[PDB]
Swiss-Prot record, chain A:
Belongs to the calcium channel alpha-1 subunit (TC 1.A.1.11) family. CACNA1S subfamily. Detected in skeletal muscle T-tubules (at protein level). Each of the four internal repeats contains five hydrophobic transmembrane segments (S1, S2, S3, S5, S6) and one positively charged transmembrane segment (S4). S4 segments probably represent the voltage-sensor and are characterized by a series of positively charged amino acids at every third position. Pore-forming, alpha-1S subunit of the voltage-gated calcium channel that gives rise to L-type calcium currents in skeletal muscle. Calcium channels containing the alpha-1S subunit play an important role in excitation-contraction coupling in skeletal muscle via their interaction with RYR1, which triggers Ca(2+) release from the sarcplasmic reticulum and ultimately results in muscle contraction. Long-lasting (L-type) calcium channels belong to the 'high-voltage activated' (HVA) group. This is Voltage-dependent L-type calcium channel subunit alpha-1S. It is found in: Cell membrane, Sarcolemma, T-tubule.
From Swiss-Prot, chain B:
The gene is CACNA2D1. The lineage of its organism: Eukaryota, Metazoa, Chordata, Craniata, Vertebrata. This is Voltage-dependent calcium channel subunit alpha-2/delta-1. Skeletal muscle. The MIDAS-like motif in the VWFA domain binds divalent metal cations and is required to promote trafficking of the alpha-1 (CACNA1) subunit to the plasma membrane by an integrin-like switch. The chain holds residues 146 to 241 of 1106 of the full protein. Belongs to the calcium channel subunit alpha-2/delta family. It is found in: Membrane; Cell membrane.
Curated annotation (Swiss-Prot), chain C:
Component of a calcium channel complex consisting of a pore-forming alpha subunit (CACNA1S) and the ancillary subunits CACNB1 or CACNB2, CACNG1 and CACNA2D1. The channel complex contains alpha, beta, gamma and delta subunits in a 1:1:1:1 ratio, i.e. it contains either CACNB1 or CACNB2. CACNA1S channel activity is modulated by the auxiliary subunits (CACNB1 or CACNB2, CACNG1 and CACNA2D1). Interacts with DYSF and JSRP1. Interacts with RYR1. Interacts with STAC, STAC2 and STAC3 (via their SH3 domains). Interaction with STAC3 promotes expression at the cell membrane. It comes from Oryctolagus cuniculus. This is Voltage-dependent L-type calcium channel subunit alpha-1S. The chain holds residues 962 to 1009 of 1873 of the full protein. Belongs to the calcium channel alpha-1 subunit (TC 1.A.1.11) family. CACNA1S subfamily. Each of the four internal repeats contains five hydrophobic transmembrane segments (S1, S2, S3, S5, S6) and one positively charged transmembrane segment (S4). S4 segments probably represent the voltage-sensor and are characterized by a series of positively charged amino acids at every third position. The gene is CACNA1S.
Curated annotation (Swiss-Prot), chain D:
Proteolytically processed into subunits alpha-2-1 and delta-1 that are disulfide-linked. Binds gabapentin, an antiepileptic drug. Coiled coil: none annotated. This is Voltage-dependent calcium channel subunit alpha-2/delta-1. The lineage of its organism: Eukaryota, Metazoa, Chordata, Craniata, Vertebrata.
Length: 48, 96, 48, 48, 48
């Protein structure tokens, strides 16, 4: 019960940071390196 | 290994060497396993029968012993059409 | 291949798990980075 | 009867080996795409 | 003819083939029936 204000602060800080990220990076990570004329993602062995 | 002479031939659209028999070992079979090095030992005595068959009938095409360990010993010797990775492409030929 | 005499030569790897898209790789007897061979390497692994 | 047990699983294979070498057959294990070419051709050692 | 015997209609998906994967080619024999090399009467069926 004494950890109610810590939780009320973490929830609101996550809510703020989510909105900030939602305004700054909304839809930027949608292009990538395909193979020319293919739908195959071009990466190297241990790369994501 | 052996560095052959490889004259050019007719009845073969390629270069053949009538001195020894060539060996094909599949790409993912190590050449040096005691099972493979033994086949390459006792098959070495085929080459004289290969030769005498050929000189008994000069119009023979490939003679091949394809053994249960993947190897294939054929005569007359001629370089395989696809090297493993000396070109960009792989060869998947298993005599079995 | 389960022993060091076996793990020699080349072998095929299949990109995208596709049985018709293969690459030749030399196979080699690798030793894990963090192992338990001596007490120093064991203490390193237990640290990480 | 030739019985092929395919994949990396945690099931029992006693019955499959029994079926195999009770009916004059044989038993093969195929854990990956690399073992297919070598296991799906070696029943001509039994048939011979 | 020295070409392989064809089956069905050829369909390819160019958009799922990396440019450097070395697809396998073929192994089939050139098995061309006698009634499929000429025109087919019911007297040629008899001769066959």
């Amino acid at each position: 019960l004494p950890l109610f204000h810590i939780a009320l602060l973490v929830l609101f800080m996550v809510i703020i940071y989510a909105i900030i990220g939602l305004e700054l990076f909304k839809g930027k990570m949608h292009k990538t390196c395909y193979y020319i004329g293919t739908d195959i993602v071009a990466t190297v062995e241990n790369e994501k | 290994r052996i560095k052959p002479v490889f004259i050019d031939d007719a009845n073969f659209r390629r270069q053949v060497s009538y001195q020894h028999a060539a060996v094909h070992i599949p790409t993912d079979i190590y050449e040096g396993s005691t099972i493979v090095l033994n086949e390459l030992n006792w098959t070495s005595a085929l080459d004289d029968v290969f030769k005498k068959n050929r000189e008994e009938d000069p119009s023979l095409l490939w003679q091949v012993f394809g053994s249960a360990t993947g190897l294939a010993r054929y005569y007359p010797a001629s370089p395989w059409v696809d090297n493993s990775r000396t070109p960009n492409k792989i060869d998947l030929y298993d005599v079995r | 291949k389960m022993t060091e005499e076996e793990c020699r030569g080349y072998y095929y790897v299949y990109k995208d798990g596709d049985p018709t898209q293969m690459e030749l790789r030399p196979r080699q007897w690798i030793h894990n980075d963090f192992h338990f061979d001596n007490v120093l390497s064991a203490m390193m692994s237990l640290f990480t | 009867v030739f019985t092929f047990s395919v994949g990396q699983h945690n099931y029992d294979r006693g019955p499959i080996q029994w079926m195999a070498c009770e009916n004059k057959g044989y038993y093969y294990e195929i854990p990956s795409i690399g073992a297919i070419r070598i296991n799906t051709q070696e029943y001509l050692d039994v048939l011979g | 003819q020295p070409k392989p015997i064809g089956v069905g209609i050829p369909t390819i998906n160019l958009r799922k083939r990396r440019p450097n994967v070395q697809n396998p080619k073929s192994q089939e024999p050139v098995t061309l029936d006698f009634l499929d090399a000429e025109l087919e009467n019911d007297i040629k069926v008899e001769i066959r």
